Amino acid sequence: MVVDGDLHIHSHYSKAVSKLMTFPIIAENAKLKGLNLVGTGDSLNPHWEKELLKHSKPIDDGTFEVNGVKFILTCEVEDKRRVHHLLIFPTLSQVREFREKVKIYSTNIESEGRPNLNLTAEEIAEMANELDILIGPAHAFTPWTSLYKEYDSLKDAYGDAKIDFLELGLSADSDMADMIKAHHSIPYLSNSDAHSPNPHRLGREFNRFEVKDVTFEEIRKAIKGVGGRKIMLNAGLDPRLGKYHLTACSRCYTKYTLQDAVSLSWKCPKCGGIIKKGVRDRILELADTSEKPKDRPPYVRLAPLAEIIAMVLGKGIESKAVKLLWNRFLREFGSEIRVLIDLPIESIASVHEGVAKAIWAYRNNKLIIVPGGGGKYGEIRIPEEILKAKIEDLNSIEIS
Ligand SMILES: [Zn+2]
Ligand SMILES: [Zn+2]
Ligand SMILES: [Zn+2]
């Protein structure tokens, strides 16, 4: 059994999160996206737990169903140093035991979706280890509220406590994270951190699990790669297009190497602007290996379907032309993820040849990329040889 899962989102109780992030609306857009499993998010908030039990039917003590969509208990907390950690709970009693354990170190457990805990990373992880709650750093390489912004290693942050996974985040893929050897024994999660239920936010990154059933316990087995269960692949954004991938000036966006920026005292000599340290160079600072684990699942670089369509059509993402073609793909094929990953290119071409070539370029890493940096997103382009080629000859075309 193959299931696609997104284990980090936020509810309407979180700051700067859309009010449309309710359980019914999240469930409907998950069906459009192709997510069979979604993390609840904000599970430490008692009002969000109320809405879950009101809107869901029990599968087991840790799995819930809302309109044909399975949910497991997840939450994100912020520690002393503003570092974010992702928690996955086996049962609701573990949610409550953890809630009472950290309540004296927080003042916003009942008023906010992401509680602020006056605790170190090790103290949070040891409480999670004590209650069999899966823990790992959220979006570990993001330039804010993340592990590697405040620490130079997992050990410095968690000490003697154990973590069960690492979340890559929107600014990193698996090959980037595998340049630090301490990560080679830690499974990777790719989650969207969705602040709105729309299919170009919900499921922007997701995991494909091979399980026997969609239960928390089966997902725990898949994360730990035991008993035939495993993560088949991680899917998410191309990190080279990220706002802060390369070290670059924040005004003119000229790219600089790391050692040039430090010798320049972080001042751009072209326009006098402030150079911002890039995520790729942050990992290069810490890189201590050239290998990656043999069993590491592949990382699939994707963009949401309506975003690919808006590029191919050269029109806005909310335009009528993009919505109609996106509706047509979802009508012919049940979900967006099926079109993005599973459909043959020839079948995608039956609806739109240009969208088919674009998706083929994504799957085969044939797109031409101008990397992002300094606050400006990267650029994408389909090479000329692909646009002129027949669909059947795409694998035979020599590129560049
Ligand atoms: Zn976060
Ligand atoms: Zn978050
Ligand atoms: Zn500049």
The Cα angle at residue 146 between residues 340 and 368, in degrees rounded to 5: 35
Q: Which residue has the tokens 């069993």?
A: 295
Using the mean position of ligand 2's atoms as its centre, give its distance from the Cα of residue 10 in Å: 6
Report how far ligand 2's centroid is from the alpha carbon of 136 (Å).
Answer: 12
Cβ within 8 Å of residue 180, ≥6 positions away? 153, 283, 286, 287, 288, 289
Ligand nearest to the CA of 269: 3
CA distance 169 to 244: 13
Range 184-210 burial, b when 16+ CB lie within 10 A, else e:
eebbbbbbbbbbbbbbbbbbbbbbbbb
Token output for 207: 């995991």
Dihedral pair phi/psi, residue 95, rounded to 5°? -60, -45
- Residues sharing a CB contact under 8 Å with residue 364, sequence separation 6 or more, in sequence order: none
φ and ψ of 184, to 5 deg: -65, -20
Ligand nearest to the CA of 10: 2
Neighbours of 347 (CB within 10 A): 14
* Bridge partners (DSSP) listed for residue 344: none
Which of 132, 233, 190 is closest to 7 using CA atoms? Answer: 190
CA of 76 to the centre of ligand 1 (A): 7
Q: Report CA 102 to chain centroid distance, whole Å.
A: 26
Question: Which ligand places an atom closest to the C-alpha of 194?
Answer: 2
Name residue 193's beta-bridge partners. Answer: none
Amino acid residing at 340: L
- Distance, in Å, from the CA atom of 305 to the CA atom of 11, rounded to the nearest integer, reads 24
* C-alpha 267 to ligand 3 mean position (Å): 8
The Å distance, Cα 82 to ligand 2 centre, comes to 12
Beta-bridge partners for 380: 369
Distance between CA atoms of residues 325 and 1, nearest Å: 30
What is the C-alpha R_g of the chain?
Answer: 21
In degrees and rounded to multiples of 5, residue 4 shows phi and psi of -105, 130
Ligand number, closest to the Cα atom of 254: 3
Ligand showing the shortest atom-to-Cα distance for residue 272: 3
How many angstroms does the Cα of residue 338 sit away from the middle of ligand 2? Answer: 26
Cα distances (Å, whole numbers) of residue 14 to 186, 200, 206? 29, 19, 21
- Token reading at 211: 């399980």
Experimental method: X-ray
**What pairs with residue 318 in β-bridges?**
none
> Do the beta carbons of residue 255 and residue 277 sit within 8 Å?
no
Residue 145 CA: which ligand is closest?
1
The whole-angstrom distance between residue 322's C-alpha and the CA centroid of its chain comes to 24
Counting ligands in written order, the one closest to the CA of 144 is 1
Ligand nearest to the CA of 248: 3
CA atoms within 13 A on the CB side of 135: 28
- Ligand whose nearest atom lies closest to the CA of 41: 2
Terminal Cα-to-Cα distance of the chain (whole angstroms): 39
Residue 282 CB partners (closer than 8 Å, separation 6+): 141, 143, 148
Ligand number nearest to the C-alpha of 195:
2
Residue 305 Cα to ligand 3 midpoint, Å, equals 34
CA nearest 397: which of 349, 371, 369, 360?
360
CA of 193 to the centre of ligand 1 (A): 7
Distance 327 CA to ligand 2 centre (A): 29
- Residue 17 CA to ligand 1 centre (angstroms): 12
Neighbours of 128 (CB within 10 A): 26
If one counts every other C-beta atom within 10 angstroms of the C-beta of residue 274, the result is 11
Do the Cβ atoms of 10 and 76 come closer than 8 Å? yes
84 CA distance to ligand 1 middle (Å): 5
Cα separation of 269 and 173, whole Å?
Answer: 31
Ligand nearest to the CA of residue 270, numbered in listed order: 3
Using the mean position of ligand 3's atoms as its centre, give its distance from the Cα of residue 4 in Å.
42
Resolution in A: 2.5
What values do phi and psi take at 65, rounded to 5? -130, 130
Distance 244 CA to ligand 2 centre (A): 18
The phi, psi pair for 179, rounded to 5°, reads: -85, -5
d(CA 373, CA 293): 29
Q: How far is CA 386 from CA 24, 308, 343, 360, in A?
A: 41, 15, 19, 9
Q: Based on the number of CB atoms within 10 Å of its own CB, is 393 exposed (0-12), middle (13-18) or buried (19 or more)?
A: exposed
3-state secondary structure string across the chain: CEEEEECCECCCCCCCCCCCCCHHHHHHHHHHHCCCEEECCCCCCHHHHHHHHHHCEECCCCEEEECCEEEEEEEEEECCCCCEEEEEECCHHHHHHHHHHHHHHCCCCCCCCCCECCCCHHHHHHHHHHCCCEEEECCCCCCCCCHHHHCCCHHHHHCCCCCCCEECCCCCCHHHHCCCHHHHHCCEECCCCECCCCCCCCCCCEEEEECCCCCHHHHHHHHHCCCCCEEEEEEECCHHHCCCCECEECCCCCECCHHHHHHCCCECCCCCCEEECCHHHHHHHHCCCCCCCCCCCCEEECCCHHHHHHHHHCCCCCCHHHHHHHHHHHHHCCCHHHHHHHCCHHHHHCCCHHHHHHHHHHHCCCCEEECCECCECCEEECCHHHHHCCHHHCCCCCCC
Token pair of 236, please?
């998410």
| Centroid of ligand 2 to alpha carbon of 263 (angstroms) | 35
Rounded distance from Cα 310 to ligand 3 centre (Å): 31
Cα(89) to centroid(ligand 1), Å: 17
Alpha carbon of 366 to those of 26, 174, 391: distances in Å?
Answer: 33, 19, 14
Minimum-distance ligand to the CA of 85? 1
Q: Which ligand gives the minimal distance to the CA of 39?
A: 2
Write out the two tokens for 322.
């993009």
Q: Residue 6: nearest ligand to its CA?
A: 2
> Which residues, in sequence order, are CB contacts of 275 under 8 Å at separation 6+?
247, 248, 249, 250, 256, 261, 264, 266, 267, 268, 374
Residues in the chain: 400
Tokens linked to 20 = 């449309």
Q: Is the dihedral of CA 105, 109, 111, 115 positive or negative?
A: positive
